[PDB]
Amino acid sequence: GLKTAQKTLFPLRSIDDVVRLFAAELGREEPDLVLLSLVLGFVEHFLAVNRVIPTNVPEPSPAPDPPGGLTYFPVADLSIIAALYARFTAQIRGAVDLPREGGVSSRELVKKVSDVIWNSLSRSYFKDRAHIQSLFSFITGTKLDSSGVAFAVVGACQALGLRDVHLALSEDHAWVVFGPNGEQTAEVTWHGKDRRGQTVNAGVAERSWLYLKGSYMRCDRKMEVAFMVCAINPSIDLHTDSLELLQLQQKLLWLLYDLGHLERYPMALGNLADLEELEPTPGRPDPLTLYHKGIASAKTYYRDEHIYPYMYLAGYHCRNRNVREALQAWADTATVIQDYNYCREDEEIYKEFFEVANDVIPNLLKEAASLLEGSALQDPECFAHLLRFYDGICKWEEGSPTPVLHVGWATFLVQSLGRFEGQVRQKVRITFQSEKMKGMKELLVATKINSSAIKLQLTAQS
């Protein structure tokens, strides 16, 4: 049952209409997670899933076709959004047996709301596909990706008036927290390419990156809106994004930023900065300000145990040919990961470190050498930052149940070391933390790089 004020905004015919509807909803003490997620899913379906008009642009009279191409919007009728809203609420309300004396919900209650979402999904589909994140995908396709399940469970709880069930976010996983002050936890979805019903205590005690040693985000309803905005997927295919969905996500994040709802959301600040890098909004903070905001947010609220705030910043410096600053920010990234244990389900962050060490840094140093042929390659500080990055990775691996470094890592390490002349490398005096890097300190600074020896040393088991 949509309140009358919710009804007046429709029909949404523009991006701003969506923004006004988000603006209107964020003013309430509890914004409608189902209504908001349906609208974004409807908009994204007809902009990215079912692309109505092609995206290509043609090469004294007017041109026969729009010479720059076309953007469009699928009008969201009240009748159509409300019909879908009614389907979900009729589904959820008839499925759970509603005392909750303290405004808190039982573990067995959260479990059957979770079970109602879980058992509504198709048994076979590709969990990693795009555009199955929203309640629109749930109700019209019975398909949800991993964190989409957790979000749907949270939206179902708001539908049943369980103000105490909230979305919990690590950097790669989602679950629910509940109880008098968010102290119980329950897994509600799978992770990886499931532990449903269990707490996350074991994973927090595991010191795996997946559970951030307990320094994860406990969302309020306002950050749960920020999550579904971050979850907007503009990809039409791998080489094509929808300009409309990028613009919508960007204006929505600015709306959330102005209301203060990204203050505890480092990844969302980083997402906004990345959008701002491609499409600056006049009068707004530049991307670097926003990257440093996300880092300050991670330091303030999650005691500096997040990884992505630093790779956001490092990526921006890399794309802008700021070699010193990019190397320093990847060193700081490795400095956070070195206090984690590399565990079974941490493959996402491994993949990102792999790409940095074995693609991004090699490319950055090659770029710098083309200028050389002052410069970063002549700066011992830059070499020290490179070694600090590898030292953190080795410390991360040390004592973990999963190996990190393999022979391919050694190949790129030897290459990156070679980018610094021996006279530069011999100026550093470094204290390493990892046993692996200590066991080749002298081999890293020698005038002649011993590739086989460094390869042997980088690949010794932890």
Ligand X SMILES: CCN(C(=O)c1cc(F)ccc1Oc1nncnc1N1CC2(CCN(CC3(C)CC3)CC2)C1)C(C)C
Nearest distance from residue 254's CB to ligand X, in Å? 15
* Per-residue binding letters, 81-120, with ligand X (x by CB under 6 A): ----------------------------------------
Q: Considering the complex, what minimum distance in angstroms separates the CB of residue 11 from ligand X?
A: 27
Q: What part of residues 125-164 is at the interface with ligand X (CB under 6 A)?
A: 133, 147
Phi, psi dihedrals of residue 115, rounded to the nearest 5°: -65, -30
Binding-site member from 206, 244, 325, 352 for ligand X (CB under 6 A): 352
Q: Which of 136, 211, 308, 342 binds ligand X (CB under 6 A)?
A: 308
**8 Å CB contact between 134 and 37:** yes
One symbol per residue from 384 to 413: x for binding ligand X (CB under 6 A), - otherwise; what is it?
------------------------------
Tokens 């979900």, located at residue: 88
11-19, 95-103, 171-179, 373-381 -> range binding ligand X (CB under 6 A): 171-179
Q: Which is nearer to ligand X, 174 or 236 (CB)?
A: 174
**From 131, 143, 166, 173, residue interacting with ligand X (rule: CB under 6 A):** 173
CB nearer ligand X, residue 173 or residue 264: 173
Tokens for 329, please give them.
């920010």
CA distance linking residue 256 with residue 251, whole number of Å: 9
What does the CA dihedral 401, 407, 410, 412 come to, rounded to 10 degrees?
A: -120
* Residue 312 binding ligand X, by CB under 6 A: yes
Site string for ligand X, 226-255 (x = CB under 6 A): -x--xx------------------------
Tokens 């509504």 locate to 120
Q: Which of 171, 187, 332, 345 binds ligand X (CB under 6 A)?
A: 171
Shortest Å, Cβ 284 to ligand X: 19
Tell whether residue 42 is a contact of ligand X (CB under 6 A): no
Cα 22 to Cα 255: distance, rounded to the nearest angstrom = 8
Range 193-222, binding ligand X (CB under 6 A):
none
Q: Give the CA diameter of the chain.
A: 76
What's CA 165's distance to the chain center, in Å? Answer: 22
**Rounded Cα distance, 371 and 376, in Å:** 10
Q: Are 263 and 290 in contact (CB under 8 A)?
A: no
- φ, ψ for residue 10 (rounded to 5)? -75, 155
Selected from 39, 152, 162, 169, the binder of ligand X by CB under 6 A is: 169
Please identify which residue in 25, 44, 164, 172 interacts with ligand X, judged by CB under 6 A.
Answer: 172
∠404-408-410 over CA atoms, to 5°?
A: 80
DSSP 179: S
Contact 285, 87 (CB under 8 A): no
3-class secondary-structure state, position 265: coil
Using CB under 6 A, which residues numbered 258 to 287 contact ligand X? 267-268, 270-271
Under the rule (CB under 6 A), what is the footprint of ligand X?
A: 133, 147, 169-174, 227, 230-231, 267-268, 270-271, 308, 311-312, 315, 352
